[PDB]
Amino acid sequence: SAVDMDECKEPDVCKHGQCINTDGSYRCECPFGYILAGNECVDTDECSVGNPCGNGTCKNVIGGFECTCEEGFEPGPMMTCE
């Protein structure tokens, strides 16, 4: 039928990312929290910036990051210390 080659659904193009099938091309636009390594889309290292916990330590996670404030507190999923 001529299925416009997805290009992004290929195992060597996007891979875990939001793409947009164009005429004869594509665009691997990763979500908010991910990135692109030449094609493979995945999560980045948010802990690479600064301990988001505010004082504890940063950790890398998906859709955000993980952090362990000064033992004795209660962190969260991928937001910050609280």
Nearer to Ca ion, 4 or 10 (CB): 4
- Fill in the per-residue mask, 55 to 74: x = in contact with Ca ion (CB under 5 A), - = not in contact: -----x----x---------
> SS3 string of the chain?
CCCCCCCCCCCCCCCCCEECCCCCCCCEECCECEEEECCEEEECCHHHCCCCCCCCCEEECCCCEEECCCCCCCCCCCCCCC
Count of residues binding Ca ion (CB under 5 A)? 6
Looking up tokens 């999560």 gives 43
Nearer to Ca ion, 21 or 73 (CB): 21
Residues 7-66 that bind Ca ion (CB under 5 A): 21, 43, 46, 60, 65
Where do contacts with Ca ion occur on this chain (CB under 5 A)?
A: 4, 21, 43, 46, 60, 65
